Amino acid sequence: MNWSKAINFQPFMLETRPPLTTIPIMDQLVEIGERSNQKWSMTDRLFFAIRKINPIFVTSSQIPSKFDYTILQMPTQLIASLKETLLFLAFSYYLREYQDKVGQMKFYPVAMKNMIPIVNYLKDRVHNNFDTTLEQAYRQNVVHTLSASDAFDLLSGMIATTRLDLIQRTRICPELLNVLNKMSFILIYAPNRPSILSWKNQS
Amino acid sequence: AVEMYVAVRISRFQLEVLRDLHDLVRSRTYLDVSKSPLATTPIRVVEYVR
Amino acid sequence: MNLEINNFAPAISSIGSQLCSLSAQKLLTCRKQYGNGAKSFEEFYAEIGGIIGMMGINSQTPSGIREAIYRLYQSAFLFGDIFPESFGIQNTQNIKPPPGFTAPAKKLEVVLPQGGAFDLIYNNGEIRVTTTRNVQAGDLVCTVTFPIQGSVIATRNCHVNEIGGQLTTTRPEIIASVPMPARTVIVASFDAIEIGYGEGDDLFAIGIAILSNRFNGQITPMSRHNYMTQMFANLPANMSERDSSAVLHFAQAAPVVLGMMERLTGAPKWVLDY
C-alpha cells in the first residue's frame, strides 16, 4: 500500500532537515552562499560548473542543505563511471523544479556509487571553453553512445530501485514521467508486453 | 476549454440507486376521517334551548 | 503450477472483483427480461451483455470483459512486467474488504512432526493418527498449515486451545494429553471454514479449463482446494492479512466468472455481493 502520487516522497529520495533549533542560523548561511556564486547548472560553462560539484557522504538526515548546490551519497566502496555520474547529475538537476521551497524540509536523491573520483578526474582535465556545457557532455556521452535500455539500467543501478521499480513508479506520478522526458527518455506502453525504451531523437 | 488551468472539484457525492422498480414506493400517515373525524364545534354548556 | 505475485496484486484484484461483480449483475438483469422469444438466450445475452461506464473495456460485447479479465489475471498472478494501462489502477489508495470466506474445511491440511511416530489418514471432517511407538503426554503430534476457524466437534485423547467450544488460533496444534502406548489412535474433528468460497464449484470447474488453456505453461486444471492451497502458499509473507483476502477473492472470482459466461446460469452471492 506504500505509494504516493508525489515526486518528493518516492522511495529513492531522502528527506533532510537541520536540527529544529538551528534552522534560523542555517538560513543566513544559505544567503551568504547566494551572495557568492554557489550554484551549479546544466547550462553554465562546464569549467565553472565542475568547480562547484562536491558530493558528500550522508550519515544522518540532520544536515543543512541548499537546493542548487547539494548532491548526496551514501558510504560505500563501489566506484561510479563517467556515464553513471552524468546520468545522476542530469537526474538531480531536472528533479529540482519540484523541490518544495515553502517548507523547512528538503528532498534529495542519494547516489549509490562514489562519484568523487570521477568528479576529480573530470575537474583535472577541463579547459575554459565558451560553449561546452554539462548538458552537452551528457548528450555526447550517454545519448550518442548507449541504447535507451542500457542507460535506463545504469540509472536504475545508480539509485536503490531496480529497473522494474522505476517503470512501475513512473505510472503513478506524472512528475517523474516529465523528469525522465527532460532527460530525453521515451516510454511506450502496449498490452501483453514489457515496456520498451527509446531516446527522444529516434522517436 | 471553458475551465481554467486550475480546476475546482468536489470530493464527495450522494445519490440513491435502485435495482428494482418496486422500491420506489414509500409510506405516509393520515388520520382516518371516516372513523376518527375532526371536531367542528367546541364543547358548550346548555342554555337557551330553541 | 508456478506463479509470481507482484507487489501491486491488491490493486489489480480490487479492479478484477468489481468487474466480475458488474458482469454478474448484468447477467441477472438479462435473465429477468429474456421474454422467451425467437432469439436464444445465448444470442440475447451477446447483444446486451456489455458493461456500461467501465473504463478499460474496449468492446461492448462479453468478449471485451473476457479480454479484460485475461489481462488483469495475467498481470496479477503470472508476470510482474506487464501492468495494464487503461484501468483506474492509479487511484487505488484504499481497497474495499471482500466478503468473508464460506468454504467448509472438509480435507484439512496438516504436517506430521519429523519423528515419524504417527500415521496420517483422512476422513470427511476429522483426522486421526495411529502411534507407531509409545508417545509421552504433552507433545505436538500435528499442526495445520491451511488456516481454519470455527468450533470443535469432538476431541478424544487430545487437547486443543479452545474456550467455550470455539478455537483460539487459526492454526490449532494437536497435543497429546495422556500417556498412550501400543499403537493407539487419537481423533479430532472440526466444524470450521477454510480459506475459499464454497458456492460456484461447477462454474469453477468449467472456468479453470478455459483459464488453463491459454496459460498451459503456468496453470493446470485441478480442484478448488488444491488451487487455494497453492495460491495461499505462493503469497508473500510480509503482507497484511486484509490484502491477502482481496488477492484470494479475485483468484477465485476470475475462473468462476469465466465459467459463468459460458453456462448462462446464476451467480454465487459472494461474487455478486462484492
Add this chain to the structure above:
Amino acid sequence: MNLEINNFAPAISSIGSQLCSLSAQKLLTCRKQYGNGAKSFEEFYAEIGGIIGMMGINSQTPSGIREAIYRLYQSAFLFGDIFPESFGIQNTQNIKPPPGFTAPAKKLEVVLPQGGAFDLIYNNGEIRVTTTRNVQAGDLVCTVTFPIQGSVIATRNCHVNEIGGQLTTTRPEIIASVPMPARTVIVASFDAIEIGYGEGDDLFAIGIAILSNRFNGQITPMSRHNYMTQMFANLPANMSERDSSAVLHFAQAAPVVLGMMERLTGAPKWVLDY
C-alpha cells in the same frame, strides 16, 4: 411412486418455474412492506400476495396460483397427458437455463457387482466395503448410479479417475488398486454435489405433504433425496442434459413453493433467481 414424464415436459417446466419465481418475488416484495397494522400478515398476503403479471392464472389470489401449480404439475408429471390450454405456451420457442445444482452429496446411491463379494455400509459422506473373499487388483468393486460431480478425498486402497483432485467423470467407478487378503476394508470419500438443490428442505417437507394429499394415488410423502432419485430415474433417454435440468428444477420447486405459500417465510435463492 408411479408417474409418467411425457415429451412436452420442458415446455411445461419453463412456465412452472417462471410462475414459481414470480410468486416468490411477490412474496418477498409484500413481506418487505407490511405495516404491522390491525390486519395480520397472512390476510395481507392473501390480499396482495397473489397479484402477479402473467397470462393464464384464473384468479389474482394465492388460491389461483395454487390451482395453476396443481394443473401444471399434473400435466407435466402425472398420468394425465392433458395440455393446459390457458397459459402462454404458444411462445415457448426457447427456454432459459435453470440454476446450477447445490445439494450436498451426503448419501450417495451405489450398486455392487451383485455377484457376491463385498459388504457395503453407508457413512455421513463416504462409503466403505469389506471383501468377503480375496480380490485381485484392477476389478470393479462398486459403481454409482446417481450422477455426482466434485472433488475426491480419503482414497485408501482403491483408485478413482482423478486429476488434480477433481473427478473426471460424473459416474466414478471404484476399482481395487492392490490385492487385499484377510478381509480388509477400503474407503472412498467425496466432497461433491448431487442432482438437486440444498436450501429449502423444510418447505419441501410441507409442500410434498400438501400435494400428496391431492394426488394420493400417485404421490406419497417422502424425503427430498429419494424424491429426486426417483424423478431422475423416470426421465426419458432422448432428452438433453439442459432439458433434464429444466424438468428437475420445476419438479423440486413445485412442492417448495406450495409449502412456501402456507408458511409465509422467505424463499430459497435457487427459486428466486431463475
Add this chain to the structure above:
Amino acid sequence: MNLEINNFAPAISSIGSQLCSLSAQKLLTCRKQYGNGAKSFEEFYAEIGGIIGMMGINSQTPSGIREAIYRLYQSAFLFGDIFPESFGIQNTQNIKPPPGFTAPAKKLEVVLPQGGAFDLIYNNGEIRVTTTRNVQAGDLVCTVTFPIQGSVIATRNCHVNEIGGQLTTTRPEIIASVPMPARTVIVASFDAIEIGYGEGDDLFAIGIAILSNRFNGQITPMSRHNYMTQMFANLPANMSERDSSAVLHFAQAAPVVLGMMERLTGAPKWVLDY
C-alpha cells in the same frame, strides 16, 4: 451464561430483526457505491452510509443503531419481564414469520438414559454407542434434547421412526432393533437441520465478544452452537412455536450484526431477507 427471557420477547425481537435487516441493506447499498480513493471504507460507511428510515430509532449514525441493538437485546433477554411500550416499542400481536433455520447439524445433542448401560462417542453427523452389557431389543438408548429435523441415513443395528427417509418427529429416539451381545456398536447418522443459521460464523465470533464486553456478568464468548443451545433451553414453557423462532432469530442476529458493523463485509441472506 445466565439470562432471564421475558414473555414479551417476540415483540422486541420483531423490531430488533427489522432494525438489523435495515442496517444490513443500507450497508450493501452503500458498499456497492464505493470508489477506491483517499477515504477508507470505514470513513465512507460512517459518513454517507448508516441512514435508515425506521420509526422509534431516531439515530442515523452507526453508533446509534449499535446502541439501539444494545437496548433491544438487554430488554428482550436480560432485564426480565418488562412491557414493550415502556421503551417506545409498540407491542402488536400481528408480526412477520422469521426465515427458516438453515444450521447444519454436526454435533447433535443426546442424553443417555440412567443405569450406565451404554457409552456415547461423537462423529461429524453421527452418534455411536457401545453396549457395556447385554441389551434386548425394544428399549431406549439415546434421545435428542435439542430439536432436530431432516432425513436419516445409515441406520445400523437400531431403528428410528421414519417414512420415506424423513424423520417423523422433531425429537427422534433411538431404540435397539435386535438384541446384541459382546460389546458391539450401533451407529445413527443424519442429514438434518438444527436450530440456528449456518452462514455468518465469522461475524458471530466477534459480535459475541462485542456484546460480552458490555454484559460480562451475563454473557461469555462461546461458539454459536453452545449459544443457541443455552438460548433455547431458557425459553418460557408456555409459548408457541411461532414466537420461539422470532425470539431465536433476533438472539442470533444481534451478535452477527454487531460483528458486521465492525468488519464491513457482506451480510448473510437470513439477515437481509427478513
Add this chain to the structure above:
Amino acid sequence: MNLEINNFAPAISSIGSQLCSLSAQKLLTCRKQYGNGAKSFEEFYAEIGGIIGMMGINSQTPSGIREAIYRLYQSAFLFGDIFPESFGIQNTQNIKPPPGFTAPAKKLEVVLPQGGAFDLIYNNGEIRVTTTRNVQAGDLVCTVTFPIQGSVIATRNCHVNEIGGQLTTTRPEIIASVPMPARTVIVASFDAIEIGYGEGDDLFAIGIAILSNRFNGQITPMSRHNYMTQMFANLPANMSERDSSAVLHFAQAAPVVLGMMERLTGAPKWVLDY
C-alpha cells in the same frame, strides 16, 4: 515487540499530540453540554465531535481522527518508512514542551553486576538484595537502568548520593556503606516518579488492543510499564531530553486517545492540557 524510531520522531509527535489534545477538548466540550433527551450520548458525540479544524484530517467523523492517529503512529514508531505528506510536519519550525511525567515508580528497574554476589527481589516501592559472599564496603550492588527522579526514604546498610533528601542524579547507583557478612539484607525505598503518566490506565489497556489488532506483527498487548520501558530502550542515544519527552508523550497518548474514543468517559489531564 519490534519497532524502529525514525529520526524525525519529535516533529511527528508534536502533530500527533496536538491532534489528541484537540480530540480530548472536543470530547469534554460535547460532554458538558449533553442535556438528557431523545438521543444518547454517543449519537450526540459522533455527529459534532469529529469536526476539528486541523491539517491532515480528511473526514468530520471520529473514524477520520482514528485513521489519522493510525497513520501518524505507523510513521513515527513502526518499521514502515512512510512520511505523512498531508499533515504540517514539513513546515514545523518549533515544538512545545510536553507536560512533566507523573507515573509513580512502583516497580523500578535495576541491573545487577556480573559477579553473582547478590540476589534481587521486588516490593511495592523498593528493592532488596541478599549477599551470597563477603563484600567490602564501597562497591556497587545495584544501579537503575530506567530514569527516575524523586526523594529517598528508608535506606539501610547502603549509601545513596543525595543532599537534603533529594536524589542528585537521575540514575542513582546503590553502594554498600558497611563491611557485611554473607546473607546480610539491604534495602532502598524511593519516593520518586518514573518516565510515563499514571492516569488513564483503563483507556491505555483498551487502546493498546485496538492498535495491536491492526499492527499485529509489530505490537502485542502488554502493561503500560513494559510498553514505556521498551519505548525508552528503543530511543536513539543522540537525543536531547526535551525531544525524548515529546516522543514519549505521543507514544503513550496514542493508545489512551484510541481507547478514549471507544468508551466516551473523561480524559486525563496530561492529554487534554497539552
Add this chain to the structure above:
Amino acid sequence: MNLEINNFAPAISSIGSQLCSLSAQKLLTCRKQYGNGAKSFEEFYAEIGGIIGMMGINSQTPSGIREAIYRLYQSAFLFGDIFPESFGIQNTQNIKPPPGFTAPAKKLEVVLPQGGAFDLIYNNGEIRVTTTRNVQAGDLVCTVTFPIQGSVIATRNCHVNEIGGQLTTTRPEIIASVPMPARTVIVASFDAIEIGYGEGDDLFAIGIAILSNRFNGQITPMSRHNYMTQMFANLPANMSERDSSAVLHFAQAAPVVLGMMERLTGAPKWVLDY
C-alpha cells in the same frame, strides 16, 4: 450498613451525578470571582451559589441542592424504593458514562479457600500467606472478591494469569506453582486500581457524617474503602458494568459534594468532569 438498591438506581444516579457536577462547577465559578472584602467566602457562596434552571430543585439557595441530594440519595440507596416523580425522568435506558476509577488498591480484599490451610497478613499493596500444612503445586491459595484491574509486580512462589505484566481477569486467583513444604510464605503484589475515586478523601469524611446525621438508622460514619466495599456487595446480581459504574459514581459523589458544600475548598476532577 443496611440498604436496598432498586432496579432503577442508574436512572436516579444519572440525575444525582449531574446535579453534583453542576453544583461543583458553580462553586468554582463563584470561587474565581470572590471580591476578598469584608464579607467572608461562606456568605458569598450562600448568597450566589444556587442553580436556577434545573427541574426538580425548588430553591435558588444552596439548601435547595442539599435537599435535592438528600431526596435522590434516599430514593436510590435507602429502604424506601420511592420513584421521584418531581425530577423529570424520561428514558431510564439513556445513561451518560461516568469517568473511570482512580482509587489505588492498597488494602486488596481476598478470601481464603475454607480449608484452613493458609495464614493471611496484609501490607501496603501486597498480600502474603504462610502455609500451615503441606501443599502441592497447582491448587487455589487466594481469590479476590473486590474487582481489580492493573499490573502485577513481584510474584514469588505463585502463579496468576497475565499478558505482558497485565492482569487478564478482573478477579485474579492465586495458585501455587511449586511443591512448597515446611511453612513457607508466598507473596503477590499488584500495581492496580480498585473501585472508586481516590481524590477528595477529605471531603468524603466530612460529608459522610453530614448524611449519617440524617439517615442514622441506615448509614454510619466509616472510611471510604469499607463504604465502597459494602456498596458494591449490595449491588444486585442482574446488573451490568455500565450501570453499576453510574450507581457507584453517585454513591461516592453524594458524600463528597455534601462535605464540599460545608468546607468551600475545590472539587475533585472526577466530580467536575462528569
Add this chain to the structure above:
Amino acid sequence: PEENVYILLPIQAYTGGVIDRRDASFSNFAYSIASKLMMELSAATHNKIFTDYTRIAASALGPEISTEGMPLFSLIESLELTEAETSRLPVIQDSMVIQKSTATVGNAQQGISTINIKRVPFVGSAFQQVIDQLLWEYSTTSLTTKEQRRQ
C-alpha cells in the same frame, strides 16, 4: 442510465442558510438552516392535520388503492422503460393498498384516547418519507377526543 438501474438525483429543496463569517464552528450553520426551515414548515401546518389524499375508490374491480406520489404513467417517459419493464407498472399500481391501524394520544393529565390512522403508499424519495414522518410527528402532539375532554 441502463436497464434495471434507476438514479434518484438529490435536488435542492430548501435554500435557507447563513455562513458564519467568524468561522467559530460548524454546528451554528446547521442549526441556522434547521431553525429557519422549521420556522416555515411549522407555519404551513398550524391548525391542520393530514387527512386528504388521492385515491381510486374501491369497487368490484378491486380494493381501494392509492395514487399519491407522482403518477406511475410519467415514469415511462422519465426513465425510458422498455416493453418488458412497462409490464411491471400495472402490478405495482395494483399493489398499493391502504393499511389501517391505531395510535394512542393523550397524557395522564388528560385522557388516554385512541385514534385510527391510515398508512397509504406513495412513490418518491426516502428523504420525502423522512420529512413527512417528521411533519406528522410534530403535528399530532397534544391531541385528544371529545369524550375525554367532556369528562
